[PDB]
Amino acid sequence: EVETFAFQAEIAQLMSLIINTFYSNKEIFLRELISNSSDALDKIRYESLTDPSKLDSGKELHINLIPNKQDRTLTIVDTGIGMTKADLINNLGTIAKSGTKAFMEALQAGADISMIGQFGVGFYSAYLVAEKVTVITKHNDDEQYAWESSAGGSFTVRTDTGEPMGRGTKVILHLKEDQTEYLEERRIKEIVKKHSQFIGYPITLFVEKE
Ligand SMILES: Nc1ncnc2c1ncn2[C@@H]1O[C@H](C(=O)NCCO)[C@@H](O)[C@H]1O
Ligand SMILES: [Mg+2]
């Protein structure tokens, strides 16, 4: 059972800009997704201080980076707080608490796309390198869901079964054909060292089986 939703207009406009603006410094997408994971880990860390049972779904707080050249995917996995179904729909589908409006105004007034994280919309930088993004997520208060969008103004949400996570979020980037550099181990290492070296959780780069 798949539900289809329209992005809020301003989010569709933001996505279109990210997809269509000429901008070569695409590598910042990884910093933005890792920062979102770090925020999610901070949140479950804090909540678990006063309710240790919130870690029954996994004590380890970390980030995994999983390249797969066969599938042309890069996946960013965390064991953070995760998202409920409502969280997915509100947080990824609408302006919500973000600075979407301020960012689009800023770009008209001299800002550039690398500043996207200052405005709380770094997630959408995924579309610098991905033709499709799938978000698998599990919150302690809810079942596992899959959010998906290839932009074009809509996204889908469905329940996700058969491969349960304990808790957290997986952002699966189905890369554009000319963005496969982000599957290369030396490139990923370079970007993590350059932009994410102070993140306060372990970041493990998986090795490919092929
Ligand atoms: N890795 C993640 N884990 C849990 N929640 C996440 C997440 N990445 C993004 N989110 C949620 O979705 C929001 C988000 O990025 N919305 C898109 C920008 O408006 C975050 O503020 C955050 O609430
Ligand atoms: Mg919880």
Curated annotation (Swiss-Prot):
Q: N6-acetyllysine is carried by which residues?
A: 43, 69
The UniProt keywords, alphabetically, are: Acetylation, ATP-binding, Cell membrane, Chaperone, Cytoplasm, Host-virus interaction, Hydrolase, Membrane, Mitochondrion, Nucleotide-binding, Nucleus, Phosphoprotein, S-nitrosylation, Stress response, Ubl conjugation
Q: What's an example of a GO molecular-function annotation for this chain? A: protein homodimerization activity
Outcome of swapping residue 82 to D: Abolishes ATPase activity
What would be one Gene Ontology cellular-component term for the protein?
nucleus
Enumerate the residues binding ATP. Answer: 36, 78, 97, 123
Locations listed in the record:
Nucleus; Cytoplasm; Melanosome; Cell membrane
Query: What is the stated purpose of this protein?
Result: Molecular chaperone that promotes the maturation, structural maintenance and proper regulation of specific target proteins involved for instance in cell cycle control and signal transduction. Undergoes a functional cycle that is linked to its ATPase activity which is essential for its chaperone activity. This cycle probably induces conformational changes in the client proteins, thereby causing their activation. Interacts dynamically with various co-chaperones that modulate its substrate recognition, ATPase cycle and chaperone function. (Microbial infection) Seems to interfere with N.meningitidis NadA-mediated invasion of human cells. Decreasing HSP90 levels increases adhesion and entry of E.coli expressing NadA into human Chang cells; increasing its levels leads to decreased adhesion and invasion.
The record's comment about this protein's domains reads:
The TPR repeat-binding motif mediates interaction with TPR repeat-containing proteins like the co-chaperone STUB1.
- What family is this? Belongs to the heat shock protein 90 family.
Its name, as the record gives it, is Heat shock protein HSP 90-alpha
From the broadest rank down, the organism's phylogenetic lineage runs: Eukaryota, Metazoa, Chordata, Craniata, Vertebrata
